[PDB]
Amino acid sequence: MFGKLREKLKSFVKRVEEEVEKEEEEVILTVEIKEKDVDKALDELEIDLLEADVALEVVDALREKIKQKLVGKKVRIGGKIIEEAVKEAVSEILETSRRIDLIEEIRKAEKPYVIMFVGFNGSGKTTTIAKLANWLKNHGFSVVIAASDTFRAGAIEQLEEHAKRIGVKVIKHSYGADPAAVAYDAIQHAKARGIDVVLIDTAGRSETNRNLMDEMKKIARVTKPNLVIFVGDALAGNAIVEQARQFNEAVKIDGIILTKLDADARGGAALSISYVIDAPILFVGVGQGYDDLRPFEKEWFLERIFG
Ligand SMILES: Nc1nc2c(ncn2[C@@H]2O[C@H](COP(=O)(O)OP(=O)(O)O)[C@@H](O)[C@H]2O)c(=O)[nH]1
Ligand SMILES: Nc1nc2c(ncn2[C@@H]2O[C@H](COP(=O)(O)OP(=O)(O)O)[C@@H](O)[C@H]2O)c(=O)[nH]1
């Protein structure tokens, strides 16, 4: 997992590690990292990362932060240190404008808390909504799901079977109905039951009459979501970022859930998407089980591309 990312960063380290070693050689208790050393290794890194599927802007940012961290620092003659700076850079690129803490922004929030999901078909949206509902239930929160994917045959029943498993109520209409009205209903429902949170499952493809971005706009306006979450399939690579970009201009994205990390041998998008969109990754999907969802933390990520 994130193997490719891990190996290209490890390659860069040992490479700078070699050209310092050489000065150690032309040798004075300490040694300094110079540009010449980095610039070249950095140039290789660029090409490596761009092959691991990291977005251009993120490779340019990493390069800046890595160079700054390395050039000038003195070392002792006779790895851990160089990797430290790289690790720092990665952390910082994973940092976002804002932070979100879900459990605390709901306890605080005036109920019901409305979360709207957006994403292209096959990204794990419905599954992810089922996982989050179960997660919020496990932490003392009452939740209900809106079946607003109304034009894809079977999606309502597909969601119904997910929600039975986890024992969550699904508010729906029927096939052919108005996606926004279903969600409006689910919200009105929760106001009356005094339910903590509503989650909205949404369409993932364009229809004869429709355009998906138009549809998400419509729903967003009717529902006034407290939070908009983009769901993207890690395996899809940089395509994930261009997808989020599209959704972000129709309806602003507040948070991200990436799925299928269990099968992501690359990691380039997971590293780049939070920076490109300026929204935090809140959870990651790591399987098809309803508990295969994990609150995201920089440490869990770094712990996976380094040690
Ligand atoms: N391996 C793996 N598969 C996942 C994960 N999340 C979703 N899936 C699978 O992706 C497929 C499509 O998911 P679905 O929720 O129907 O996607 P949707 O079209 O975006 O709603 C299903 O087979 C899910 O089991 C994950 O974290 N890991
Ligand atoms: N689609 C749908 N909407 C519901 C359901 N239950 C409640 N609602 C919404 O909740 C609103 C009223 O909530 P409620 O206190 O149960 O009853 P009411 O005030 O007499 O309508 C209705 O206008 C519905 O839009 C439901 O099972 N399905």
Side-chain angles (χ1 to χ4, degrees), residues 1-3 5-26 29-30 32-35 37-52 54-66 68-79 81-83 85-94 96-97 100-106 108-207 211-216 219-241 243-296 299-302 304-307:
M1 159 153 139
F2 306 158
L5 191 37
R6 191 173 61 263
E7 297 301 335
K8 293 279 158 234
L9 297 177
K10 293 272 179 179
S11 178
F12 166 86
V13 173
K14 290 188 185 64
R15 275 177 189 162
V16 170
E17 192 182 5
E18 284 169 9
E19 321 267 327
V20 191
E21 222 209 301
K22 260 92 282 195
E23 198 72 8
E24 196 164 290
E25 237 158 49
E26 274 227 309
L29 268 144
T30 54
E32 304 84 354
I33 298 185
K34 302 180 181 178
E35 280 194 51
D37 310 331
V38 301
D39 305 312
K40 202 244 45 109
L42 285 183
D43 260 29
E44 279 284 338
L45 181 57
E46 287 218 349
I47 301 308
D48 286 345
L49 292 176
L50 276 185
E51 193 267 318
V54 176
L56 279 162
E57 42 187 296
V58 177
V59 310
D60 282 336
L62 259 188
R63 192 191 174 93
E64 298 268 49
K65 287 175 160 70
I66 291 174
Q68 193 280 326
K69 296 282 170 51
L70 288 181
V71 180
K73 68 184 308 141
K74 300 180 180 180
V75 297
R76 300 180 60 180
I77 303 180
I81 297 219
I82 303 276
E83 187 192 7
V86 175
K87 205 145 134 43
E88 261 221 328
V90 177
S91 260
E92 300 184 352
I93 233 93
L94 249 19
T96 52
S97 259
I100 276 166
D101 170 352
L102 196 38
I103 297 208
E104 203 98 328
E105 183 187 337
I106 294 174
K108 150 203 288 181
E110 177 216 331
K111 288 129 167 128
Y113 195 67
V114 182
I115 311 185
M116 164 179 179
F117 294 75
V118 292
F120 286 108
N121 281 339
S123 290
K125 177 160 41 195
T126 302
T127 299
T128 291
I129 284 169
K131 293 200 267 203
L132 175 62
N134 188 40
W135 186 90
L136 304 165
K137 252 227 319 274
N138 288 346
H139 295 240
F141 281 109
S142 63
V143 26
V144 42
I145 303 173
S148 293
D149 196 0
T150 62
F151 305 118
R152 202 198 106 231
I156 304 180
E157 302 163 53
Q158 196 179 50
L159 160 68
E160 281 188 272
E161 214 190 318
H162 278 296
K164 177 178 311 306
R165 256 91 123 168
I166 68 182
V168 168
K169 194 181 256 147
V170 168
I171 298 322
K172 73 191 151 140
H173 287 184
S174 64
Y175 180 76
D178 187 35
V182 176
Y184 183 79
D185 270 7
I187 294 159
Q188 296 320 300
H189 181 108
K191 286 194 177 127
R193 298 292 180 85
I195 306 194
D196 291 323
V197 28
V198 177
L199 304 174
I200 300 162
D201 191 2
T202 200
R205 76 182 169 181
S206 271
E207 228 77 346
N211 200 12
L212 172 69
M213 300 308 169
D214 288 334
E215 281 258 287
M216 300 303 92
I219 286 148
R221 283 186 202 281
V222 176
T223 54
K224 299 160 173 304
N226 293 253
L227 194 75
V228 181
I229 295 175
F230 162 93
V231 176
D233 169 341
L235 316 187
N238 195 56
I240 200 173
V241 167
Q243 282 171 199
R245 275 194 224 273
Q246 287 165 336
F247 280 116
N248 204 30
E249 101 168 319
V251 50
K252 169 212 22 196
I253 297 152
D254 302 324
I256 299 172
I257 298 189
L258 301 189
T259 65
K260 315 184 196 168
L261 279 188
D262 47 300
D264 187 11
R266 336 181 62 203
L271 169 64
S272 302
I273 195 185
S274 80
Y275 184 95
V276 170
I277 302 297
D278 197 22
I281 295 179
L282 321 172
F283 303 89
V284 291
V286 294
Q288 307 196 202
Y290 295 135
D291 66 311
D292 292 344
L293 203 256
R294 165 201 278 293
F296 182 72
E299 209 62 48
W300 169 91
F301 182 87
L302 292 163
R304 289 184 155 58
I305 71 189
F306 294 113

